[PDB]
């Protein structure tokens, strides 16, 4: 930073070990003070290596003489005296980081927070921040997982993540803080941090247990409130990893989970695209989920869930691995919530497929097909129409429904004329065909 004026390498070499011997157990503070004077001299002479060596020797003396409080105020004075040399203080903090990790003790939490306070005066991206990150992680480990330190590691990560990350260390730190966030069971902030970090991909092509760990922490976060499409998307994103690391149990359970979720997702064009892309997988055929998807994807079949719970419901009781199945529906509270989600999901699926087939269907038959009563069926019909998914008009006093838009006479006669022109073109084509075949057949 600033040019060296007067070096004291000879002085420190000749005196520092003698000082260490003179205060082997650290009972003398005059030694600390005189090395402070020497390093002040070298600082006014603008020497960095001598000051760094003096600070390292001071903290080493404090280590060997185990005076924890005097260490705390000593390092406070060192970091606050005039700021000294940024290189030297970054060094001293680094050896303090190396030391605090080896002795368990009770007040090493106090040591960690003291160094955190010394480094949090600023100068984070500049002059070492990995030390502060490691100290926060060490605090996490010391407190064994709680909400306060989880919030701390939440609010710490951003500056270093933006400034100077590591393709492995920084992302592992992010993964080790998001899991604490989810353990705290905060959802808004955990969602925010997950969505702000997941923009950094194109390293997962060489992941070992990193993309899968991220995804298996964010599964709970998404599925906790209402997510069902991102659920299937990142479950297939964890499915494609056993493709390069073919391990049968995890592979097959991921297949089961993704097949279940993609069907369970609310109906949309994108969900249709995903289900059609999923269907036809050569490696998907050997599981009952193959039959489940083939039945429940297309051809507008009557998805009577009362029948399905035994026709294709064997995944709840016993299947090949049935572990994702037991996670989804075999659970008690969230399991029954997902059971109800299957129930309604199939109700809207039946309503939708009935929309494109039956114009007017009686209320009793529709309720019986939806496995509910008249009022529940009309409530779900209202829930669809307010979402504009279906064009439905109901007479409630008569309880009769219609799905066809009233045909305006303009386009009615237009399609009539188009039918006429189709017939005319058919007349032309048939005339040419029969005349020419007549020619070939009377060539005799």
């Amino acid at each position: 930073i600033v040019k060296m004026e007067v070096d004291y390498s000879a002085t420190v070499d000749q005196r520092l070990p003698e000082c260490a011997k003179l205060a082997k157990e650290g009972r003398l503070q005059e030694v600390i003070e005189t090395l402070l004077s020497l390093e002040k001299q070298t600082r006014t002479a603008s020497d960095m290596v001598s000051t760094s060596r003096i600070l390292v020797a001071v903290v080493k003396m404090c280590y060997e003489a185990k005076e924890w409080d005097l260490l705390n105020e000593n390092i406070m004075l060192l970091s606050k005296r005039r700021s000294q040399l940024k290189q030297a203080v970054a060094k001293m903090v680094q050896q303090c980081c190396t030391y605090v990790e080896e002795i368990t003790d009770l007040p090493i939490k106090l040591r960690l927070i003291d160094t955190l306070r010394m480094v949090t005066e600023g100068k984070i991206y500049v002059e070492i921040e990995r030390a502060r990150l490691t100290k926060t992680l060490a605090t996490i480990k010391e407190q064994n997982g709680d909400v306060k330190e989880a919030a701390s590691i939440l609010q710490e990560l951003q500056v270093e993540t933006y400034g100077s990350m590591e393709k492995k260390e920084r992302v592992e730190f992010i993964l080790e803080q998001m899991r604490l966030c989810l353990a705290v069971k905060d959802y808004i902030r955990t969602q925010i941090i997950s969505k702000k970090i997941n923009t950094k991909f194109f390293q997962e092509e060489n992941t070992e247990k990193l993309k899968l760990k991220y995804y298996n922490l964010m599964i709970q976060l998404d599925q906790h409130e209402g997510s069902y499409l991102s659920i299937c998307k990142h479950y297939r994103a964890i499915y494609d990893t056993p493709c390069i690391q073919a391990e049968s149990e995890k592979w097959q359970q991921a297949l089961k989970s993704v097949v279940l979720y993609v069907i369970l997702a609310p109906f949309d064009n994108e969900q249709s695209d995903l289900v059609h892309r999923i269907s036809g997988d050569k490696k998907l055929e050997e599981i009952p989920k193959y039959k489940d998807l083939l039945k429940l994807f297309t051809t507008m079949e009557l998805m009577r869930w009362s029948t399905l719970v035994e026709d294709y419901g064997m995944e709840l009781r016993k299947g090949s691995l049935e572990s994702p199945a037991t996670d989804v529906f075999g659970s008690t509270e969230e399991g029954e919530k997902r059971w109800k989600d299957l129930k309604n999901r199939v109700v809207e699926h039946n309503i939708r497929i009935m929309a494109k087939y039956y114009t007017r269907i009686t209320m009793k038959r529709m309720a019986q097909l939806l496995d509910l009563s008249v009022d529940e069926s009309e409530a779900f019909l209202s829930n669809l129409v307010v979402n504009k998914t279906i064009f439905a008009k109901v007479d409630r006093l008569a309880g009769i429904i219609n799905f066809q838009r009233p045909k305006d006479p303009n386009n009615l006669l237009n399609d009539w004329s188009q039918k006429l022109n189709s017939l005319m073109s058919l007349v032309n084509k048939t005339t040419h065909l029969i005349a020419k075949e007549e020619m070939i057949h009377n060539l005799q």
């Binding site: 951003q158 993540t161 400034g163 100077s164 990350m165 702000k196 923009t199």
Partner: protein, 261 residues
């Protein structure tokens, strides 16, 4: 824009202080790559970094090479060329060049010489008083040039960081400075090796003896050393270059710089 991204393979052609190159890349690239995170969390990305070593290792060479991981277009702009007339309206030229960077959004403005000859002659304190510093404050308040939106940084390749207006090193200022000096023995032998790379002759790999005679010689001087070895060989009209040619080149350049200094 005059200099563009292609030809950015100098990451191996720099040789010396590869750790320094790595540190500058670590400082620069991430906001240059994904600045949106900085807006997303509410933190200001850095503006650039300062480079020392007035005649030493190629600061412009580093500017070219570090943009390898950046896929950006380095621009070699001169402080005098930016200030033109000695008026505060010199900001018009900086506006034009920043608009050029904005058009070629992935860009890094490499400054040529801000502390005009930091080793001697007139510094920031002498000659033009505060004109340089006010023009730099113009680019300083430019920092709100949509840093989140704009993939533009500015590297300050000064000669000597001695007279650099310490008011321009506070947070929000240029901030980061990376230390570059005359190459050490290791960097010197490495850059000698990379200079000799294109040269395929009999010679030897006796690089340490060459280093011994040519210690404290800048990277440009060592490139000139290799060129002088080639010149000696061709003046002899010899298709061979031996360590004696290297000795002659090193002695020639050493005597030349000794007389010129």
């Amino acid at each position: 824009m005059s200099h563009e991204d292609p030809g950015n393979v100098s990451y191996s052609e720099i040789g010396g202080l590869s750790e320094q190159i790595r540190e500058l890349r670590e400082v620069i690239e991430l906001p240059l790559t994904n600045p949106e995170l900085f807006q997303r969390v509410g933190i200001i990305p850095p503006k650039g970094c300062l480079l020392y070593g007035p005649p030493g290792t190629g600061k412009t060479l580093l500017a070219r090479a570090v943009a390898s991981q950046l896929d950006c277009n380095f621009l070699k702009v001169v402080s005098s060329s930016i200030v033109d007339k000695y008026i505060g309206e010199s900001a018009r030229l900086i506006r034009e060049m920043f608009n050029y960077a904005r058009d070629h959004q992935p860009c890094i403005i490499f400054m040529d010489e801000i502390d005009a000859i930091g080793g001697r002659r007139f510094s920031e304190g002498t000659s033009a008083d505060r004109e340089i510093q006010r023009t730099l404050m113009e680019l300083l308040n430019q920092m709100d040039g949509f840093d989140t939106l704009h993939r533009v940084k500015m590297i300050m390749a000064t000669n000597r960081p001695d007279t650099l207006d310490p008011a321009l090193l506070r947070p929000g200022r240029l901030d980061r400075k990376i230390h570059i000096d005359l190459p050490n023995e290791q960097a010197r032998l490495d850059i000698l090796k990379i200079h000799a790379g294109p040269i395929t002759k009999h010679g030897e790999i006796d690089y340490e003896a060459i280093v011994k005679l040519s210690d404290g010689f800048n990277g440009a001087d060592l490139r000139n050393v290799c060129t002088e070895a080639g010149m000696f060989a061709i003046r002899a009209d010899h298709d061979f270059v031996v360590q004696e040619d290297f000795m002659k080149a090193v002695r020639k350049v050493a005597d030349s710089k000794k007389l010129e200094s």
